[PDB]
């Protein structure tokens, strides 16, 4: 039960920079800061290194997880 | 032909009009036993009459607005005792012993700070 609504959101920052890497065929790692940004089909294959708040984590995107959000893959805190 | 005793209570005002009638007591276009549907007491309100051997020898039309059915049950019992004397004054005489004529001052107390409600005070420990 995740309520985005009737108007999905994806912070352009990478949207544009990720949509472009498709033009050249593909790229080699990125690095967002809007972990708040959702996810769309044009990710599969890419590797958007998100911030934990301390580091840049390489999150290898995949079909299965295309609906999720960057943040759910960049673990904030540490424990045991 | 007409008499009016009030009777307020806990924020309940009751206009108690008394007419010579045979005793068809009723409220806001609703039979007495119909506004106070199954409320054990209620009957109380009439005690004043029932107390002056009246009851059946006198009719009453009454209003009421504000508070809770109960309160009204009480207020009404008052006006019905007030106008009842506003009628015959030599009525207080033995209507006073029981006192169906005494604005029940007892009213809800305020909510002071640092408490839960006037008195109910927060509990504590390690003391």
């Amino acid at each position: 039960p995740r309520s985005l609504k009737k108007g999905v959101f994806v912070d352009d920052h990478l949207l544009e920079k990720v949509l472009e890497l498709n033009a050249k065929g593909e790229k080699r790692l990125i690095k967002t800061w809007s972990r708040r940004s959702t996810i769309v089909p044009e990710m599969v294959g890419h590797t958007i290194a998100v911030y934990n708040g301390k580091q840049h984590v390489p999150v290898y995107i995949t079909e299965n997880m295309v609906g999720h959000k960057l943040g759910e893959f960049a673990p904030t805190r540490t424990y045991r | 032909e007409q008499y009016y005793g009030t009777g307020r209570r806990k924020e309940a005002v009751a206009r108690v009009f008394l007419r010579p009638g045979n005793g068809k007591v009723t409220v806001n276009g609703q039979d007495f036993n119909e506004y106070f549907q199954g409320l054990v007491r209620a009957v109380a309100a009439l005690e004043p009459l029932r107390a002056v051997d009246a009851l059946g020898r006198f009719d009453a039309y009454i209003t009421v607005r504000g508070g809770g059915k109960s309160g009204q049950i009480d207020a009404i019992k008052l006006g019905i005792a007030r106008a009842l004397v506003q009628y015959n004054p030599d009525y207080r005489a033995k209507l006073k012993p029981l006192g169906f004529l005494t604005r029940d001052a007892r009213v809800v107390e305020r909510k002071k700070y640092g408490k839960h409600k006037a008195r109910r005070a927060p509990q504590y420990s390690k003391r």
């Binding site: 999150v59 995949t62 299965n64 997880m65 999720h68 943040g71 759910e72 893959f73 673990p75 | -």
Partner: protein, 118 residues
């Protein structure tokens, strides 16, 4: 009778007995007791071998309850896990999921207390 995959509610009311089913609750009842018109308040004991059929056929082939359901849910979780999903984690590490305070009151997910020398 045995409506959903091997069921056995009986002697009770129906809008209540159907409940004893997996994908069935006080909701999917009234529906089925309507989409199949049956005096709701009837002891299942007093059920028509005729109605028990319409009731079965509806409920069974109208939803995803019992056996097959228990597997779907588990499938989403198991899925949630496969990917490094936060939620997919809290599941692995027996801890509340829907954003809750794991300091105090967290029992239900964690179970019994493990009191240690403080």
């Amino acid at each position: 009778a045995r409506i959903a995959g091997v069921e056995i509610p009986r002697n009770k009311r129906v809008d209540v007995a159907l409940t004893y089913i997996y994908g069935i609750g006080k909701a999917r009842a009234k529906e089925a007791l309507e989409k199949t018109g049956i005096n709701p308040a009837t002891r299942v004991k007093d059920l028509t071998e005729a109605e028990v059929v319409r009731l079965r056929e509806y409920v069974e082939n109208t939803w995803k309850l019992e056996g097959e359901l228990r597997a779907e849910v588990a499938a989403n979780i198991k899925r949630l896990m496969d990917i490094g999903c936060y939620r997919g984690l809290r599941h692995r590490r027996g801890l509340p999921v829907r954003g809750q305070r794991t300091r105090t009151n967290a029992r239900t997910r964690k179970g019994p207390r493990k009191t240690v020398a403080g």
